[PDB]
Design a protein around this ligand. Structure first.
Ligand SMILES: Cc1sc(-c2ccccn2)c(C2=CCC(C)(C)CC2)c1[C@H](OC(C)(C)C)C(=O)O
Ligand SMILES: Cc1sc(-c2ccccn2)c(C2=CCC(C)(C)CC2)c1[C@H](OC(C)(C)C)C(=O)O
Ligand SMILES: [Mg+2]
Ligand SMILES: [Mg+2]
Lengths: 131, 131
């Protein structure tokens, strides 16, 4: 289904990377945050919900969505309840940037634009077709 | 054209709001940043470029894109060179959130989901059709 996203945290250079994957397309969005936190999770989900039609969200760590503040965000937005590929691309471009967050955003761009249509294309098409 | 975006800063409660508008749809993305800065502008544009097919970017303050670091970002991403509506929605929801950034993201969501198809729909459709 086009409304299903996966959301997980990974660690790199002592920082946290929140990664969201649109399961049907392989499209990703990601952000660097100081540490795993219900507030960070909540605010990311607000941002995500505001650009795409997010219906459900899965994770690999159920306890991530336990906090009151994450549930409140899912309520308001009407939400219900790739590390290796991305980590790879970050290594290739890490040299070209100072900050990890910049390398993340470069990799996310590399990821979504690559062809096999690109992930970035498939999300748009899948979502348009389902309108 | 579907690759044209507008990018501007506005001020509210002594903070800065970077606002991007996809001109053909009225879709917006926005972020709260400490102060107007070439680095902030640059990093936002990386993020934007990574989710949409951004071809050109306009602004109301040409000097915003003057810095070396903003030009470098446009180069790497292959980019070339609503305050009142959004400000309104922020006032309506300001009460319901502590942080300005949360109120921004709530308003951006309100904005993109409203019907007259919604802005969020029109971006997806416009971009899908042009694939
Ligand atoms: C802190 C800086 S300075 C800087 C830069 C690069 C070339 C010329 C001037 N500044 C950059 C870059 C801008 C273009 C790229 C492709 C996004 C990667 C490197 C950065 C970059 O951080 C920003 C994006 C917050 C500014 C970084 O982490 O290295
Ligand atoms: C700092 C907090 S705590 C908190 C909250 C709300 C209800 C229950 C528990 N926490 C919230 C909210 C979560 C849901 C909404 C719809 C996004 C708005 C209010 C916030 C919110 O900041 C976050 C998003 C960084 C956590 C805020 O600025 O008020
Ligand atoms: Mg750093
Ligand atoms: Mg605040």
């Amino acid at each position: 289904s086009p409304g299903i996203w996966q959301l997980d945290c990974t660690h790199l250079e002592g920082k946290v990377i929140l990664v969201a994957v649109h399961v049907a397309s392989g499209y990703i969005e990601a952000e660097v945050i100081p540490a795993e936190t219900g507030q960070e999770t909540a605010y990311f989900l607000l941002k995500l919900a505001g650009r795409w039609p997010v219906k459900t969200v899965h994770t690999d760590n159920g306890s991530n969505f336990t906090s009151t503040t994450v549930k409140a965000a899912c309520w308001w937005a009407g939400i219900k309840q790739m590390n290796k590929e991305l980590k790879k691309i970050i290594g290739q471009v890490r040299d070209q940037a100072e900050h990890l967050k910049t390398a993340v955003q470069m990799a996310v761009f590399i990821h979504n634009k690559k062809r096999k249509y690109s992930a970035g294309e498939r999300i748009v098409d899948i979502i348009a077709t389902d309108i």
